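Colleagues,

For the teaching module next term, I've prepared a clean inverse folding example: a structure given as tokens, and then the sequence designed for it. I'd like students to try predicting residues themselves before seeing the answer, so please don't circulate the second half yet.
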């Protein structure tokens, strides 16, 4: 759809290249990060690499599902980390761009 095309070529294009994008371009590696509780707390991991792959393979049936994947990625970050962590602020900056671009998505 026009909306999924927009999410791929506008929203993800802007978010993927952002200076703050790098921790979100692939799954949280709880083993490399020394986080034995990450998967005990975060039951649905999500990342931009997964979302990008889903958009490339036409995995989504509705723009709202892709939006939920973005939202889950950000919420995972806010829920697992501590309020003062830099990563929370990076998520907030990316999420603001996400919402700003979503405000201009084509209707269906
Ligand atoms: C794919 C790996 O990516 C990461 C990379 C680095 C990294 O600096 N080096 C630095 C030098 C690199 N060289 C340089 C020389 N060359 C020849 C070879 C390559 C090697 C790797 C750190 C963390 C990463 N990965 C991450 N992925 C999700 C999260 C995440 N870190 N952080 C953030 C903390 C501050 C910024 C990222 C979290 C940390 C704890 C708990 C949760 C989260 C979290 O919520 N997220 C989403």
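(Answer key — instructors only)
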């Amino acid at each position: 759809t026009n909306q999924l095309q927009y999410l791929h070529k506008v929203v993800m294009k802007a978010l993927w290249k952002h200076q703050f994008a790098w921790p979100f371009r692939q799954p949280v590696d709880a083993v490399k990060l020394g986080l034995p509780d990450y998967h005990k707390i975060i039951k649905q991991p999500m990342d931009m690499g997964t979302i990008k792959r889903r958009l490339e393979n036409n995995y989504y049936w509705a723009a709202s599902e892709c939006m939920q994947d973005f939202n889950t990625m950000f919420t995972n970050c806010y829920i697992y980390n501590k309020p003062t962590d830099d990563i929370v602020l990076m998520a907030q900056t990316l999420e603001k761009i996400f919402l700003q671009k979503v405000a201009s998505m084509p209707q269906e």
